[PDB]
Amino acid sequence: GPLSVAPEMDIMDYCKKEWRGNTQKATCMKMGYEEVSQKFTSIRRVRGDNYCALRATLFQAMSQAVGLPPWLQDPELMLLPEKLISKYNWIKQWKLGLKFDGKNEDLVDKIKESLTLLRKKWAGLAEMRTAEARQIACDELFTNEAEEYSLYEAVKFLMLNRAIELYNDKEKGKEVPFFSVLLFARDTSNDPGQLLRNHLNQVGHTGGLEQVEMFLLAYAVRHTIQVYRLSKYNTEEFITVYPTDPPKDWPVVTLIAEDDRHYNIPVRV
Ligand SMILES: [Ca+2]
Ligand SMILES: [Cl-]
């Protein structure tokens, strides 16, 4: 299919096209792009569907991949679908986001296939000897075909796993990050099953990640997500980093968000 992350263009040309006229919002948005443009020259427009936040984050993480992170090296990752679904039968209420090949007879098989794909593609990008080869390959992967959407199934599953872990830690009285307190405080998300039924199952289908779920995404893929929040320009939230205090060895991916549903990718040479 066509690219789901558009070819790059100059960021101020993008701004000039998008934000015309004299409203206060238009002026704020221009100031916001001017801020971004101090560090990045170009922008790639990420498809604005209900996967937008996942697409933006994953595209940029994968396009920057020069290694395979430990969490993807871990043999346990491939074992997780069986362990979790066997333990927590309610995970079978999972809403699939593509049609899987018929070799895949159950949910465990489907999720395992998606995690295997994520691992294989990431490993292959990390092995590439030129940055150019890696962007060619990454581009090809985000072409609106089943492979692309299977990556999001993997990432959503990792988000669910991390949320289960954080919930169970809180239940054992262990220290957890505060974002997880806020995640579970939502009246539609009081436990992991509610998170799945009312939030994760909607992601890619009827809505995108909420603010609090960007923390969960960052934790799930162990990337620090640095977001220029252009709707927050004249406040301290003009950038928000998810999470605030990550391990120093998590890679950083930078995004731009005019609002919470739409993330684009700033780029530079
Ligand atoms: Ca190129
Ligand atoms: Cl024009």
Residue numbers in the entry: 78 to 346
Give excerpts from the publication.
OTULINcat was crystallized, and its structure was determined to 1.3 Å resolution with SeMet phasing. OTULINcat adopts an OTU fold most similar to OTUB1 (root-mean-square deviation [rmsd] 2.1 Å, DALI Z score 8.7). Interestingly, catalytic triad residues His339 and Cys129 display two alternate conformations. In the “active” conformation (occupancy ∼30%), the catalytic triad is formed by interactions between Asn341, His339, and Cys129; e.g., as observed in OTUB1 in complex with Ub suicide inhibitor (Wiener et al., 2012). In the “inhibited” conformation (occupancy ∼70%), Asp336 pulls His339 away from its catalytic position, and Cys129 flips to an inactive rotamer. Linkage specificity in DUBs is not well understood, and the structure of apo OTULIN did not explain its Met1 specificity, because of its structural similarity to the Lys48-specific OTUB1. Ub-based suicide inhibitors that comprise an electrophilic group at the Ub C terminus (Borodovsky et al., 2002) covalently modify most OTU domain DUBs but showed no reactivity against FAM105B.
